[PDB]
Design a protein around this ligand. Structure first.
Ligand SMILES: Nc1nc(Cl)c2nc(O)n(Cc3ccc(Br)cc3F)c2n1
Length: 429
């Protein structure tokens, strides 16, 4: 199973030319290495992502021009003795100008957070392209030389800081890799061993997903053995860039925050209203950078609205299955209603609520709007059982009414004092 492509074939025959970019870039650079990211291990993530993006560029072009595909792999090698960590990719390399002009690569710089000396070799995938070597110690001055024996792609060799040698250990690197890069879009190896094994299905055309795939991914993100009770595959580009999958568990009573097929936070509870905390799955957007009160709240609402409609349409696609779901999760809806501030938010959430009707036969649950059809005001009755609710003289004088058999349901109706073109009033007035 041993497989590695990283070895020291490159070399520079001549001398290098020294460069020092402008003071501002120097500041932005010291900023990236000191205060940009809150975690240091994430450098393994950023570089990996950059490699993946480069490989697609090659594949997309080799296909757009109809040529055979080479080995599109991503390799990471640790050296504890030399205290080094290397990452190489076959993805279409960088030109000489690029290696000088750039500064995308905003994430490549993250390495200086852990490295005191960075060493790079690149060879643009275009034929007849030359390989070049890029050196730097983080002081704002880099060297460029023409290198030989450079394979098409990019190779990065990091000489860790005296205190960051922990990464040079394989086990540590694999922990980080499996933490962030478990869904990378290209084969990834670490000292020879393939690490990733998961497909980020949340990027596929929803019409091209299979049920067993959703079950596997649900059991991963949720870490359960039951199957999904409900599944929502949401892609959006008009409000914001969203690619997510939401699962309602089969068993009765969090969501991951990915981006560019790489994970930022595993418990992105902010992305969904607190009353929807029972949802599992993933949400992936290109709009996110250990604190979150950001404007991404708009996302938190786009999802809140989208999920509501999803739960409404489901009620109209299967009433008994949704009835079981509501009997199992209505606690959250009533909570989110009692907690909502704008009455519009409450009424939106309340559209999921279902009750038994005086005109409907016992055992039938209806939404507020559905009852609204037969109508100038809504009227309910909080009684223990259907027999008691029908026998009720308060009801005996009748036109159509709804029945509550639990105290929290009555309190819920009393919280949202009104609904749409209606007013919620107790028959026991
Ligand atoms: N990994 C990878 N692969 C490819 Cl093809 C890239 N093209 C880029 O512009 N960057 C970012 C970048 C800019 C300057 C320097 Br020095 C290094 C570096 F990585 C790439 N990174």
């Amino acid at each position: 199973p041993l497989h590695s492509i990283i070895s020291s074939t490159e070399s520079v025959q001549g001398s290098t030319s020294k460069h020092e970019f402008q003071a501002e870039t120097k500041k932005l650079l010291d900023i990236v290495a000191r205060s940009l990211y809150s975690e240091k291990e994430v450098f393994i993530r950023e570089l990996i992502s950059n490699a993946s993006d480069a490989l697609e560029k090659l594949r997309h072009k080799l296909v757009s021009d109809g040529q055979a595909l080479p080995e599109m792999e991503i390799h990471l090698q640790t050296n504890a003795e030399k205290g080094t960590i290397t990452i190489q990719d076959t993805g279409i390399g960088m030109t000489q100008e690029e290696l000088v002009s750039n500064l995308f690569g905003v994430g490549f710089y993250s390495a200086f957070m852990v490295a005191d000396r960075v060493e790079v070799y690149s060879r643009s995938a275009a034929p007849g392209s030359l390989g070049y070597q890029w050196l730097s110690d983080g002081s704002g001055v880099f060297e460029i030389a023409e290198a030989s024996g450079v394979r098409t792609g990019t190779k990065i060799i990091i000489h860790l800081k005296s205190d960051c040698k922990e990464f040079s250990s394989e086990a540590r690197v694999r922990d980080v890799v499996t933490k962030y890069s478990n869904f990378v879009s290209f084969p990834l190896y670490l000292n020879g061993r393939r690490m990733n094994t998961l497909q980020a299905i949340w990027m596929m055309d929803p019409k091209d997903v299979r049920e067993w795939q959703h079950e596997e991914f649900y059991r991963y993100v949720a870490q359960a053995h039951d199957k999904p009770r409900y599944t929502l595959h949401y892609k959006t580009d008009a409000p914001l860039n969203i690619r997510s999958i939401f699962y309602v568990p089969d068993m009765k009573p969090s969501v991951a925050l990915y981006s560019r097929k790489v994970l930022i936070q595993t418990k992105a509870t902010d992305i969904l209203p607190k009353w929807l905390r029972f949802i599992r799955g993933v949400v992936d957007s290109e709009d996110i950078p250990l604190q979150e009160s950001a404007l991404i709240r708009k996302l938190r609402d786009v999802l809140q609205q989208r999920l509501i409609k999803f739960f409404i349409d489901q009620s109209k696609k299967d009433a008994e299955k949704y009835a079981k779901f509501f009997e199992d999760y209505g606690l959250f809806m009533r909570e989110g209603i009692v907690t909502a501030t704008e009455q519009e938010v409450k009424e939106d959430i309340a559209k999921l609520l279902r009750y038994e009707s005086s005109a409907l036969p016992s055992g039938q649950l209806t939404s507020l709007s559905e009852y609204a059809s037969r109508m100038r005001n809504i009227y309910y009755l909080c009684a223990p059982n259907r027999h008691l609710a029908e026998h009720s003289p308060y009801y005996e004088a009748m036109t159509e009414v709804l029945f509550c058999f639990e105290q929290f349901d009555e309190l819920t109706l009393l919280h949202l004092r009104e609904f749409d073109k209606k007013k919620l009033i107790s028959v026991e007035t």
